[PDB]
Amino acid sequence: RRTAFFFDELCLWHAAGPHALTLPVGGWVQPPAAAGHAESPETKRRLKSLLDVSGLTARLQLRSAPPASDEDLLRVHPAHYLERFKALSDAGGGSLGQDAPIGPGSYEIARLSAGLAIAALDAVLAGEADNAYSLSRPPGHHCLPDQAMGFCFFANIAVAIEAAKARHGVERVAVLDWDVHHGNGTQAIYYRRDDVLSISLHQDGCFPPGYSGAEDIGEDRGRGFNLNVPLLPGGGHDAYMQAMQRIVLPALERFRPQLIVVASGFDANAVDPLARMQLHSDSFRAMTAMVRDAAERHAGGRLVVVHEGGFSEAYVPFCGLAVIEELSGVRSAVRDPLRDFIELQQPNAAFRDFQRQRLEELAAQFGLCPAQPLQ
Amino acid sequence: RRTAFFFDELCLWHAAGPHALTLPVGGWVQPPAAAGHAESPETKRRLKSLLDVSGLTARLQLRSAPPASDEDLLRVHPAHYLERFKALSDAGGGSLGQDAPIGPGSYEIARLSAGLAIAALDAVLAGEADNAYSLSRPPGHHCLPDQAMGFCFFANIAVAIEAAKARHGVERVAVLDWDVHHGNGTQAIYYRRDDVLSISLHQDGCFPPGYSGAEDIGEDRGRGFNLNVPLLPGGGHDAYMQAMQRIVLPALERFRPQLIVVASGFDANAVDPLARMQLHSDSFRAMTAMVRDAAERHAGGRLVVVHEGGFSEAYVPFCGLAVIEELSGVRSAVRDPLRDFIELQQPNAAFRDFQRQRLEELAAQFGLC
Amino acid sequence: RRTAFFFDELCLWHAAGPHALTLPVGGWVQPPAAAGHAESPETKRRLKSLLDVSGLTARLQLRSAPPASDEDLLRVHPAHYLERFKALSDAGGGSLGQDAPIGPGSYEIARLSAGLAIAALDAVLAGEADNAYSLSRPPGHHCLPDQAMGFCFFANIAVAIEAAKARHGVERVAVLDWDVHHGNGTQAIYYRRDDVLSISLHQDGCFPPGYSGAEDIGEDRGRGFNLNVPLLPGGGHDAYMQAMQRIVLPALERFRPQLIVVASGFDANAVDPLARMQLHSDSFRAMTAMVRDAAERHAGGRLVVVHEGGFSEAYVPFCGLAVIEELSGVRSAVRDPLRDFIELQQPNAAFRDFQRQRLEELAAQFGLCPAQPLQ
Amino acid sequence: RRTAFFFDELCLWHAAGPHALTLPVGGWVQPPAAAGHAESPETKRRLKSLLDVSGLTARLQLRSAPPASDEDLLRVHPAHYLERFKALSDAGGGSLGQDAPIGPGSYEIARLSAGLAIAALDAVLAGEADNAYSLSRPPGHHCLPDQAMGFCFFANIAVAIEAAKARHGVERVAVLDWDVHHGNGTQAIYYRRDDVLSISLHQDGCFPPGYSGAEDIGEDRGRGFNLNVPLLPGGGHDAYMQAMQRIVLPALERFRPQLIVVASGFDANAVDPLARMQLHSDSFRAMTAMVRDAAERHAGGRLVVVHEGGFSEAYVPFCGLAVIEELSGVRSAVRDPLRDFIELQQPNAAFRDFQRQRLEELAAQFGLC
């Protein structure tokens, strides 16, 4: 298998003002002596470093891309938003919204991030690669057309899809969003559309705070083409496996995607500060295997994974490595040193059963028939 | 209310070798560009900085203490353990056990940490203060007599209790351990004893990994005098409130403690990387209120809170501040900026009810209903 | 001796946007993975930590102070400057000038820094202490009345002096500025005044860049009441000792100060990135001893040392500790672990002689008679 | 021009125990909240990042290399030194000498660093590239055969030269060492040899502390084939240009090198904490131009630049970029933002003249005038 790795060093140079985790410094929040922000470069940089020393980068098709044009961005965002973003970026940065801080030059770098997503879809649709991974920083899946949120400043995946439709005329794209937070940007943009199936697995009520969203299934033309799976906080491997088998795979089976895009955050990992789920690297490996399989049966193998969240410096690299091994069909010598340990922390039988029953009920609410994958 | 704050700057100078969170650097674990260890000074330093900026330090009785003597340490740990610890500390540090890395001078600093715990109990028992908070770094509650674990190198609380019994002859001490991990050190040391009631609230299976422990209630003379409450991962405020009201307060009521010691980690907070629970600063405020109340009723107000775990730099200070406000009866101008946000993320009604039913069953199992 | 240590934890919470040393992040300057700015809290925080663990803090008279009022600040700065500073500070920070970046809440913290300086002079003038040290962050000595420069946002020492004149009517204050950079703020404010003798020891041409200033001795009423000693880059202990003995002590002798204020940066230390001089902790000890002596003979012992620059995290604490030992008359158990090493790196005889001859010529240019200290 | 860039990500994973700048943490030296060591990865990583963002990496011949074999290392270092290094590396690290701390796995990574130097000489001697740059971390130029010093654990350049002589039979190599500290490792190894001309430009008395060395010109067969230029602290661009024109270029002219190797530290830069000199990125550009020119005239263009010291995170990348632009003949869009500022800080005319006169005298002493 030929996997394109879309990466640019410059995406790692985007940096907001001082923050303690996600809290803007000021008031009662003391400046951290080192850290600086949640959406730091280090988590993505360490993924890249581990890919290099493992020998995996040598086996991928390593690509960059031009930054997203105004044409591409305007399919989603209004000019006055671009202008506001740019002016704030040229004046040294600041706050572009609620939980949306930017640094100097962040406009240009956000454009580059969006271009990588655009290019990754283009490459896979054009037959240049079987699948692709885009290390797109800053992330995209919370961003609304006219409102930056959740450290996202462009709707990377939505911009990529709209560009893909204009260049290739793809008619059915599925977006599976396994970032631990709710993919509200993708949901809102495609909410009344049936050419895009948007599925979000997320921790119930995490971000946006208090939002579950199971009853939000899309409207009119898009009714049934948006699906939220609000998993109970504390869940791990089995919760995600059950969600995949009872909701995701049956939904993709019904939708028959010609392209699958994954909004892949790794903030469901067991040591992430920004959520409470218990995934290990093999959990992300298994989800990728399931989604790759779905792509091989419906979409001619056309799968793109776009990097979204994931805050843990120590553990994100191992989770992201697992995904890329699974996309490329290449297994490195890397051994996840937290794997066995995270196994022992998983929910007990009673808790697993309780989450399983809720997923069964949810699959029934959605009108998903428990069929088996086929071609 | 007169609250003693036991603190020494030197406790913040203990530092292990390079780690990525809890993973020792080496093999596939790249050295972090900044961070360093999990048990870093910063989390405790930022608690101290927020206490100072809030003006609350000015209302406490600020104290240090001599480091723990060999006499005190030897009540719990063997001489060969002290020697082994010391030699490794003199030779620049390294690994004293599984998840127990030390740096140069860490022996001396561990002794100082233990002395603060000793002195805090002493002060409260002697009537020098109504209650006390000991910012004891490195922490203590995982450490066995001859085995360092979980970044603990001396059993600070056990060492403090044994010293208290020798100096004051206190007969009944309750140790409430609300660090999110299991207080296995305190459990093992006091396991066959009824002069010490050890209670651990912890995330089911977190650390030690795979351990719940509800059935482990003590043995022979200590049967019934150890209680584990393994809360489901993902739980937050209500889970802890229910645990306090159905298990902890009834257990303390039955035991009639003459002194309450709290092993207070803040790693149950909603943004901690080292567990999966959802507590906010008012959760720790409420638990402290409930334990203070229990102390006022049985123990002449004698309450000591010893700092244990808590990894989140950003949020531990607010949780620790809340505790100390509650101990002192002084409310500062500090407003927790995550509070409203963490409310919205709490378990839904169905999950709350599920955890509540388990706690009811557990309280029945323990004969506390 | 009774030494007041004016300190507030909140001064350590002032933090600018991301910088690589002194370079604002953006363009070709990548965000640092840890550091964040030159004027970081850590250098001052580590001074405070070393003072604590040494037992010295227990022997000082530890004080805070109210922040500087508008009244006090307006003696130097215009209202529109205060308003501009404040607005930028309330909007999350940014760039208040050339090399003058601020963070959110920096206005309030700058006011606190200035209040510590005001209070330190007040305490010493009121007989509450023999001398004082003010750990005033952010620093002051580059700041002009209507222009922030060199990470200084208020003219701390000038604000303190003008307040001291209003409360106590002190008639002759000497400001000795041994920060390695030129004290241009103090120079410009007091330039035509003879009630304030301003003396700057600095590295020739360091900051402001290209400025030496030996011929800038004040004008009209202030002619002869400003003195610049531009020391050659590379100089260390002997260069500073010779400057003190041939220029500073004779100048103070002529001026008969009723109060001595020291603008004490430690960026002349041998490992500072922001200059090229070779001082060790005993060099700062000796300069403090000389200045304390001058204060005991003219000023009733009235000496205030205000912390200015110093970037080295490792070595500033030892230099600042040395000063405070010398102010308090208390020698701790701390042993400077770079001392012997820095001794061996000092300029050779030929270089020492070359710098000595220039200082002799300069003392003659200034019309300083080589008299001996007396009372 | 075809420039090989020898680089391996794994060299950036070497990391010693906690230090404050160069001071080992312990005693009165508090652990830094962020930093860690002087010889940190960041300075070299940021050079690599700027090369990538500039598009210059795309114009180089990017290479890695096998780590140095025992055969190669043993030409310089004894087996017992390898064993001692390795054992300390397997046991988590510690102190291999005075200013020579290592971390876990540092033995393997030091071997990799040395292999890059070996491979860079090999490539240039074999005609695979016109010149080369080796980003060899950890550095090499202070390391003696049986004594680690100055954060160097193998004598990278010496090991590379000895390997080059065995494989290619090159007879005359010049080593120009413009790291701001004295290249004592290269000086001592080649001290009685005339097949290697070792030249060190360094700050008078910086490191090793108190050493100038102008009188140390080699002995017996090597007499005249070692040259030290101890520049006065505080010197910058002109001092270095004068040293190059009056000492270095005439010496190379007399020696007729078949290969030039540069020990290129950037710690002479104007903002380095580890010395007191005032170089900007164009200074390193000019020195590289002058040495490339010398290589074109005697050595068929054969020039290798091996990365040594340089501590400034902010400014080393710009200085290293300048060198590589000059090697490759490719000028990127990068503009050095400190350049104009460092011009204004240069020594005045009187100081320049004073240093110039000393260099004239020194060139006369050496018989090069």
Ligand SMILES: O=C(NO)C(F)(F)C(F)(F)C(F)(F)C(F)(F)C(F)(F)C(F)(F)C(=O)Nc1ccccc1
């Ligand atoms: O993973 C992310 N996106 O998928 C994320 F953006 F990083 C986030 F969503 F996790 C968040 F955006 F980081 C966050 F967690 F949602 C958040 F926005 F950072 C926050 F935690 F919700 C947050 O910012 N909380 C705050 C609460 C009060 C005041 C300021 C911030």
Ligand SMILES: O=C(NO)C(F)(F)C(F)(F)C(F)(F)C(F)(F)C(F)(F)C(F)(F)C(=O)Nc1ccccc1
């Ligand atoms: O909070 C603590 N004490 O109250 C704690 F000991 F720090 C801990 F329990 F959080 C812990 F030590 F951090 C830990 F969780 F036990 C642990 F040690 F960090 C760990 F998570 F167990 C851990 O470090 N696990 C590892 C597993 C494999 C390899 C390295 C580390």
Ligand SMILES: O=C(NO)C(F)(F)C(F)(F)C(F)(F)C(F)(F)C(F)(F)C(F)(F)C(=O)Nc1ccccc1
């Ligand atoms: O020590 C200081 N004051 O006494 C100092 F402010 F930190 C400084 F003066 F050293 C400085 F201000 F730090 C500085 F060194 F002068 C400086 F301003 F930071 C700088 F080094 F001069 C500087 O900022 N240089 C720059 C050059 C080009 C572009 C931006 C900044």
Ligand SMILES: O=C(NO)C(F)(F)C(F)(F)C(F)(F)C(F)(F)C(F)(F)C(F)(F)C(=O)Nc1ccccc1
């Ligand atoms: O640049 C270097 N090599 O080219 C260097 F070796 F790193 C150094 F020379 F800069 C050095 F090693 F940093 C150093 F300068 F030699 C040194 F080791 F850092 C030091 F400055 F010598 C030093 O560390 N001195 C100490 C003195 C006393 C106690 C601890 C350290």
Ligand SMILES: [K+]
């Ligand atoms: K999601």
Ligand SMILES: [K+]
């Ligand atoms: K849809």
Ligand SMILES: [K+]
């Ligand atoms: K517990």
Ligand SMILES: [K+]
């Ligand atoms: K018990």
Ligand SMILES: [K+]
């Ligand atoms: K000065």
Ligand SMILES: [K+]
């Ligand atoms: K004047």
Ligand SMILES: [K+]
């Ligand atoms: K040299």
Ligand SMILES: [K+]
């Ligand atoms: K030689």
Ligand SMILES: [Zn+2]
């Ligand atoms: Zn997320």
Ligand SMILES: [Zn+2]
């Ligand atoms: Zn814990």
Ligand SMILES: [Zn+2]
């Ligand atoms: Zn300065």
Ligand SMILES: [Zn+2]
């Ligand atoms: Zn060097």
